[PDB]
Amino acid sequence: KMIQPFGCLLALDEKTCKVIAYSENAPEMLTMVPALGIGTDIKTLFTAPSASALQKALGFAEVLLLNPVLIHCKTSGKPFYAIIHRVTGSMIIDFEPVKPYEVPMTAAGALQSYKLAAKAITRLQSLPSGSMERLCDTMVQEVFELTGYDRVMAYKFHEDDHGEVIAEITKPGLEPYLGLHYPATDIPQASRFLFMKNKVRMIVDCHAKHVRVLQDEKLPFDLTLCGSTLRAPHSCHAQYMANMDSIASLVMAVVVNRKRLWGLVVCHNTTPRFVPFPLRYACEFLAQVFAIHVNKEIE
Amino acid sequence: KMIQPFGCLLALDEKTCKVIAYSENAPEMLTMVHPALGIGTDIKTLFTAPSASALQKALGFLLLNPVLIHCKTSGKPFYAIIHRVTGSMIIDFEPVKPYEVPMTAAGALQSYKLAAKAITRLQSLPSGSMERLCDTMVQEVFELTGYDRVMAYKFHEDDHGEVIAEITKPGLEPYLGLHYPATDIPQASRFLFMKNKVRMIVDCHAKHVRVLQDEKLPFDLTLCGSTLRAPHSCHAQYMANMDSIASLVMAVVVNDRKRLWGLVVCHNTTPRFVPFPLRYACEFLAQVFAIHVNKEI
């Protein structure tokens, strides 16, 4: 029930379209502090066509969900990307903030993001088969040019489930990890499914003060939120990251197919870092492609 | 000096950033009709400030397209697509429904993601069959665009064209295997096919619109590369006899030793428009198709 404080979270009831859980920083972020709490209808917060654009999604099944919806707060004119997913009877929105001079550029930032992702995919296919080393080298390189982080590493999970840094690129001056071997318990099991579930997963600042999520108290159970892109890490991984002077990361999951988590393609930064939803989504596609050629060379 | 009427055009002086030529419809599309728009207008008066400063930043450009803009009072939104010529900067304006503006980026990711699916089905093909390559592409395109008819043209060594791959909606006469003379496509239309990469005709019976420029302009304003450009009135008549009212053409250039190897072509039986992000995503699907075509050769 914790989320990172670079965006905010709102869950709604699918039938009524009324807030049934909100993150602690939502009302400061989305209104002028007409208020926001349990109960709020969403027409009272955004402009009409953002509001009208959210309600259409209720109807779309999750084989027709198209993110991000670009929204504008009613009064402030403040613009966010809204990022939807569905857990049985309930909608859950991640809002992520848009700088104002990006609003005119949102279609062609989308297009460019995929354009780089697609090209890097071409460089992948044209590679001669046989070598896991040049493949995984190309993967981490392309991801480095694509994402700008301070370090990029692939991992590979052996049958014991422990991992070996099998590939690596960094900006000049940083200590290497290429080759090293760490224990299978360094990544807990329920974390491993979560990676499998949210194909891309992002931590903007491990020293962030995290924020709480408040649900309607007339619900007899607790609502599932670990799908949200604003999922807050465990405080244990946050200290591990700070000690090793990696403060941001972005993760990609390597699921082959007999379906298994093979590995992870990862970026680490030594200062804060935020990449917006159009990129993260491009990386979903690169990840699948990479999973397919990894499985090919196993054969 | 004419453009298709679904959009409107503007060209700006590269130095002063005021209008130096405008399409006749444009005062009606951009202003809800000095006259609000003519030779001399500052675009600062036409649009809203961040839409205007979005445009002024392209004067320093590398160019990314399309820039969504809004008009001053109405708030009508447009995709604004930009390209460069010698002393000026040209803008095509295309219409964007006001209640889909929240869905712009998602309609942009959703198109380029389908194109990228087609690119992997192509590259995973067993090599050694030009017939298998084209048959997939025209079927991949056939699902991406949704026109009534997709075909491939191959240009022989005497420049005549052959329909070497096709897939259609059921009930239409197939044109597969047909040959046609070289004079059906003049050489200037082939160079423009190489330069625009992807060209669209929305309604070959649409009445075309003239572009007016101040005649004291010290150079001629060329609309060669403008996504609105009208067809020559000869092709709009040949299209009607074939029952094709709208098309979408994607050139297949090899060694980009540059030569136009052929075309991937979409014809439809009723008017049909597709917004620029998709066309942009197919602009890459063609390049990947030309790269595999050259391998087979």
Ligand SMILES: *[C@@H](C)[C@H]1/C(=C/c2[nH]c(/C=C3N=C(/C=C4/NC(=O)C(CC)=C4C)C(C)=C\3CCC(=O)O)c(CCC(=O)O)c2C)NC(=O)[C@@H]1C
């Ligand atoms: C505390 C409860 C335990 C814990 C939790 C935890 N760890 C992760 C993710 C990673 N931990 C990694 C560990 C290693 N081991 C190495 O040798 C190494 C190089 C210095 C690292 C970083 C590791 C590889 C990951 C994967 C993510 C990554 O950035 O590479 C998580 C998931 C975080 C999330 O919410 O996304 C949790 C909860 N880790 C411990 O060490 C404790 C035993």
Ligand SMILES: *[C@@H](C)[C@H]1/C(=C/c2[nH]c(/C=C3N=C(/C=C4/NC(=O)C(CC)=C4C)C(C)=C\3CCC(=O)O)c(CCC(=O)O)c2C)NC(=O)[C@@H]1C
């Ligand atoms: C009048 C000046 C001449 C003319 C001009 C013209 N033609 C095109 C494009 C095409 N013409 C095609 C012709 C054929 N011939 C066939 O047998 C056949 C199959 C039934 C067709 C469609 C042809 C293949 C094209 C290419 C475009 C396409 O639809 O695939 C153009 C270019 C139009 C533009 O502005 O983009 C012009 C100017 N065509 C004639 O027939 C006259 C002799």
